[PDB]
Paper text:
The helical NC, together with the RNA polymerase L, its phosphoprotein cofactor P and the transcription factor M2-1, form the HRSV RNA synthesis complex that constitues the minimal infectious unit of the virus. We explore the polymorphism of the nucleocapsid-like assemblies, report five structures of the full-length particles and two alternative arrangements formed by a C-terminally truncated nucleoprotein mutant, and demonstrate the functional importance of the identified longitudinal interfaces.
Since the structure of the helical HRSV NC demonstrates the involvement of the CTD-arm in the longitudinal contacts, we supposed that shortening of this arm may abrogate inter-turn interactions and thereby transform the non-canonical helix with asymmetric units composed of 16 N arranged in ~1.5 turns into a classical helix with one N per asymmetric unit. In spite of the truncation, the N1-370 mutant retained its interaction with P and therefore the corresponding N-RNA assemblies could be purified following the same protocol as the one used for the full-length (FL) construct and analysed by cryo-EM. The most glaring differences with the cryo-EM images of the full-length (FL) N-RNA were the appearance of two new types of coexisting filaments—the herringbone-like helices and a major population of unforeseen rigid stacks of rings. The rigid polymers coexisting with these helices are D10-symmetric and formed by alternating bottom-to-bottom and top-to-top packing of N10 rings. The ensuing 2.8 Å resolution cryo-EM map shows that the NTD-NTD stacked units are indistinguishable from the N10 double rings of FL N until the end of the α-helix 344–358 and the beginning of the CTD-arm. In the rings and helical assemblies of the FL N, the CTD-arm of the subunit Ni protrudes straight onto the top of the CTD of Ni+1. However, in the stacked rings of the N1-370 mutant, the truncated CTD-arm sharply pivots away and, instead of engaging into a lateral interaction, tucks into an identical site but on a CTD of the opposite ring in the stack.
Author numbering:
A (entry chain D), B (entry chain A), C (entry chain E), D (entry chain H): 2 to 370
Write the structure that this text describes.
RNA sequence: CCCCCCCCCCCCCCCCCCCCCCCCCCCCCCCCCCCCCCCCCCCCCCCCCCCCCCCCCCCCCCCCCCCCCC
RNA sequence: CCCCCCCCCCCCCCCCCCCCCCCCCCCCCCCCCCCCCCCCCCCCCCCCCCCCCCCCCCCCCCCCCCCCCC
């Protein structure tokens, strides 16, 4: 029977990758600092001092946000995440200590952290800039409120909201989503961009881009922190904003699956073409694979999971071209920089999707009605 | 088959969030006072003294109501709630002690509580104001009744009724439901607003708004206290009022689901439009998700649960516009400040819902009858 | 039942027009000459003399061709045709006689016809021109053949072939099909355009246009002559050419019916639009009417039959626009000067018909396959 | 319903042509000789004298064969045929008479016919040539047999066999089938081409071509004579040869119908193409029309019947191209000078028909087997 | 990003039952005859036949993926 | 009372055909036998029986219809 001349390549590749009986273990290189719940207050203080500092220097904001996320997770869970990701990690204990230095010819008390990645001078200078900006702004408006201070419990979570936007745009492969990050961080968080002098979305976004590029394990740590944070029973409104912006990253890098479901929903006719119907077997194969994967598959491209390539639909040029055409016809493709590889099917689907709005729907009374 | 080109994104996101294998643990900052059953009588006395004090100062009423709720729960359950919500809490023991001070040049006996959040001066001044207001009102009417006193066992529960109204309106994101809270606290509790001189709904509502804004864990504590209180076998009539006002908050922030069920019930025709039928698959997805969640989902938006965004229907502009139009046509939309994002479907549904009252119903004898 | 809210207007109009119990009888004005079988040879001689005359004057060729057709029909059938068409006719007997005149100072014998419409001078001058052209061409090539002479039995039928082309293009309402007539008379009849010096398609076509414009009863006579000629058991090859060119006129003025059948055959999707399906009832009404009429309906527009307007499809703007779009997309519309009255449906159908050639066909596996 | 958007143009045209209520009547011009059964022996004698005359002059053989056919039919049936064909005929009586002339200075008795088309000198000279050729051949071989004489009763029927071959090739429109006529008259009738000195196929074929070109009514007369001859109960072997060669002309000019039936029989796949299936409705229309016509339709193109154009299949370019391709692939198209108007379908069908011989047949186990 | 409206609940009437009535009552041990069963003939098998025998390595192309908005 | 609007229609391209091909061809009479058919016994019926039988007139009331608008 010709019906059994078939090969389930996607499922077989998945079974090969999921049934490996040997494991690799990478070496991060530089030692990882693992803060615990103890220093969460101090890291939040540092984030607040960065936020209240106008004309601020955000060169180290990405690392400080990563430290805050790791302190929220806790040392045990951070270590367990790093092992489960397949890393050899030098767990570095983080504890708070005092440092005494004379600036302006006056003895001064600073409370800093033992971070191998972040030197004492940097934290001291962050405090100095924050203090003098606070002095100037207190002079210019008289009395402060808990709104204008580093002691707010959500100062770190605003920085992590910026990180969540960066994560949403990470799947583009470079810093091309920086403009989108800035635009969305101006739409969202506009009250904060009033309230905090140093909340500069572009600088923080660039810092997080840099830290994610240099340390790929921080992407894994941040994704699992975002999943753990989104699994809480509740929280403040800033944590709700972070959860909403983080789940905006679900399915990033897999827009074609959603647009294919959309093209099925609007019932585009060019799904009835000969070549599309030729590829439909493996297309349904891919969709069933995505469903069997389920929730974990939504962050494959952000995490650079090796099995991300199994979810691709560009390996079916005709179906992909029809899907892109339908997306462009419905007016939702935007600046999507993926290009069709069957221009004719793309144009036909685009035209039909455009007439799907002036000419509402097409019946199929043809053929017996 | 084109029927298997589908993705269950809502369910996959829920499974991802519910199957997390790492947890975060937040730090509240300031220490939490955890009163036990021992001081419930004293906290109720404090609430009664606040209530019988005319021209009262309600700056601290929200914290005192929170303390009363936590004392009703007990220290064990309050601590367990705070852990289950994912908080690091400094459990502060609350016990009663005496303080002696000379006011009016006379030695005076006061019995106060060891609360870190509430200083002794504040409790002393509350007692002073209550005592002199009691003296003045006793002078002006001769003899008091158990109706006019702080020893009533429901004085704290009236304050918690005001808190329940504030909770009902918390999902609006700000203090825009203050007018509704005042109106409902005048409709309900009018006998009390006679009986208690200091029962000022606006001041207590503002105090509870402030305490819920500053301490997001108090929202969790109060919601679980309200659920535990509503699980009792019975109580007084004020506790019944509190239970009725608290379950008025169930489903807050999710009005569109109820209005969609309503639009299905009145059988609005614009549910048969092309785009609405395109979105119906994911709409049924969302409704099945809400049902699988069940009872716990009714307080997701009040608690700022991260999975609250999964219940949204505004991600389907056509269905949402039809639902808003049907609600506006039936005359129940009120001042709902959500706006349609398909004006045409909104207007069509509104018009049909309006003719659903003069022109009772429409048969579908068209097509074969 | 809403299914019986229907009116069969086309069929009712046809029954009203076909069941009239009173008749009109028009008056042609000028007397009609009715030649019989006797003078068929002489009229064919006259046509041959016109054909062999180079640089000829074809002012009277249309009338002579009409006389030849009427002589082929016979006087009885010509009279019966004129009565059945509803005309009052002065039947004029045509017989041959001799006329003697002196040209070049020499007595000369001419044999002419008693035609009221055609004077003796005209026939004499036709003979003179033919004779001297024959003399010149005999001088220039030495000896003639039966190919180069007026005695050929098909000289009149060539002129009637030109008349048949003019009839094919008569439905345009004016002399706009003259170029098409000339082009087709050059493609066909090229051997004759060699063989006959005076076979000028444009002059003969203009003469036939003039005679059909002045005498509308000659259109009826010629159409019924063409039907009678095409009902013969056989004939020469020129008669076969005439029959082929005459049946090319069948269905002239009713191209939209054929193009609608074509759009049904290529299964254009825009036949499934809402408005097209609204009009489909009356469209099927018109097609059933055309079929009930049958063969006689193919010459309604040429004859200016009053019931020609009942076969129109432009009374359904959406279906007509779809049909024109399908015709233009398939590349067969040419210079058809009818214009769509629904531009959107026209463009949509044109686009789909164009993709019907690169993208062969579209299956309807959508909806359950 | 879209299924009733249809027009039966072929059948409607046939009904229009078959239901004409007026008739034309052509004039042959020159008078028709109508021999009766009386002079059949003399006309057969003339044909035999032409046949036994070596190096003969066949300028008049076509007319003599026509006279023999008309004498076999009889005067009554010849006249009735000419009327039924729609001709005005001057019936000329043919009778035998004697003419006396002195050749070689000697009185000589000749018995000739009163034929207006054939002068006495021609018959006399035919007899002279036959007599002297007979004398020379009798001298050269001594004694004659009934094989070598003009008195054989089939001498006229051999000439009519040559006429039958010419009729088979008449549908080509010119004298392009002359080579085929000569080849078939050499294959058949080779014993006669031994036996008769003047049986020159090319000269007789040219004479019959000429007479059929000049007198189109002789084609009708000969076709009906051949039908009447083929309706006899029996005859000689030469009459059987004539019947076989005459029914070889049945269906001449309609090869595409037979080749389409053939392409259906060999089950060519390109009959499943989209455009072919578009045209299949009108193709089946044409085939049903041909079957309804039946036997009379086999001589439409030979007789130049006006309804011959209704049997054409070239009005369906795709089906015609597939049919020509299948014919060329099977190796039976020969020098058929009709050309495809869809080269692609022609080539595809030709290729499949070629692989129909090395690769016997193709099953359709594809799709469920 | 999400969200945004309105809304305490309840309210009536109401005991139920009520009579009459013990049940049973007759007749009737069961069985009973005749009959042992079996009975013949018959070892089974018997031939022919080892099996195998050809041809044949397989492979060979192209291809990172992603990119929108929220 | 009813009615009340708008609206001529048409418009393109296109003669058709074209090849090959006589048919047939062998063998063959059929039949063949046997056979008359029938054959017996037998009349049928047979009794009893007239049928019917009573009671019974039927009916009984009320009630014109209609009414608007168009």
């Amino acid at each position: 029977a010709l019906s059994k001349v078939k090969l389930n390549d996607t499922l077989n590749k998945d079974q090969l990758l999921s049934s490996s009986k040997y494991t690799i273990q990478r070496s991060t290189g530089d030692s990882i600092d693992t803060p615990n719940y103890d220093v969460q207050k101090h890291i939040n203080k540092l984030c607040g001092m960065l936020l209240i500092t106008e004309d601020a220097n955000h060169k180290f904001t990405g690392l400080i946000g990563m430290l805050y996320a790791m302190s929220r997770l806790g040392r045990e869970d951070t270590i367990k995440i790093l092992r489960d990701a397949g890393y050899h990690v030098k767990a570095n204990g983080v504890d708070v200590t005092t440092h005494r230095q004379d600036i302006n010819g006056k003895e001064m008390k600073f409370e800093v952290l033992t971070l191998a990645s972040l030197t004492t001078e940097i934290q001291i200078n962050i405090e100095i800039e924050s203090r003098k900006s606070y002095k100037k702004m207190l002079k210019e408006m008289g009395e402060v409120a808990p709104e204008y201070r580093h002691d707010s419990p959500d100062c770190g979570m605003i920085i992590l909201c910026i990180a969540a936007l960066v994560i949403t745009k990470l799947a583009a492969g470079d810093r091309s989503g920086l403009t989108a990050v800035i635009r969305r961080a101006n739409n969202v968080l506009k009250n904060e961009m009033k309230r905090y002098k140093g909340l500069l979305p572009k600088d923080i976004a660039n810092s997080f881009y840099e830290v994610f590029e240099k340390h790929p394990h921080f992407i894994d740590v941040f994704v699992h922190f975002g999943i753990a944070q989104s699994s809480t029973r509740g929280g403040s409104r800033v944590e709700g904003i972070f959860a909403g912006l983080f789940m905006n990253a679900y399915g990033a890098g897999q827009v074609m699956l959603r647009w294919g479901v959309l093209a099925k929903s609007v019932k585009n006719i060019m799904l009835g073409h000969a070549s599309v119907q030729a590829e439909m077997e493996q297309v349904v194969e891919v969709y069933e694979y995505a469903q069997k994967l389920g929730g974990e598959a939504g962050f494959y491209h952000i995490l650079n999971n090796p099995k991300a390539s199994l979810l691709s639909l560009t390996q079916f040029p005709h179906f992909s071209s029809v899907v892109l055409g339908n997306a462009a016809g419905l007016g939702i493709m935007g600046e999507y920089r993926g290009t069709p590889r069957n221009q004719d099917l793309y144009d036909a689907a685009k035209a039909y999707a455009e007439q799907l709005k002036e000419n509402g729907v097409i019946n199929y009374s043809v053929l017996d009605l």
